[PDB]
Amino acid sequence: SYDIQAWKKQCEELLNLIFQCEDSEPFRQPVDLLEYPDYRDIIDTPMDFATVRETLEAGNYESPMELCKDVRLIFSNSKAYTPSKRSRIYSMSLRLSAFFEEHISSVLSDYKSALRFHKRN
């Protein structure tokens, strides 16, 4: 269980589960500005799950903490852009965030444990 590289395939599997969740539908592609004309007046750094998957598959994440920061940005952008807490799309973001956090905690713990074991001497 001290495999330093194991997080990558664990993150690919978790992204597959997020793409099967109906709650991911608003977050699978960059927000469309035609529909939401004020989006970049509110959101400095757009993020979505296809961008996360492509960054992972390009080999452009060094750690699962970096992937986790980008996924958390999807959720903080939804909270910043929502006009109410009683919003459909923001409500979907909260359920999807709880699912993501429940599954990513072991991926982070195992990676950090593997790196500590690598430095143990």
Ligand SMILES: CCCNC(=O)N1CCN(C(=O)c2ccco2)CC1
């Ligand atoms: C994949 C389809 C493109 N997604 C898309 O247009 N949006 C998802 C992100 N948005 C929000 O987080 C939000 C919160 C409240 C209202 O929208 C804006 C709309």
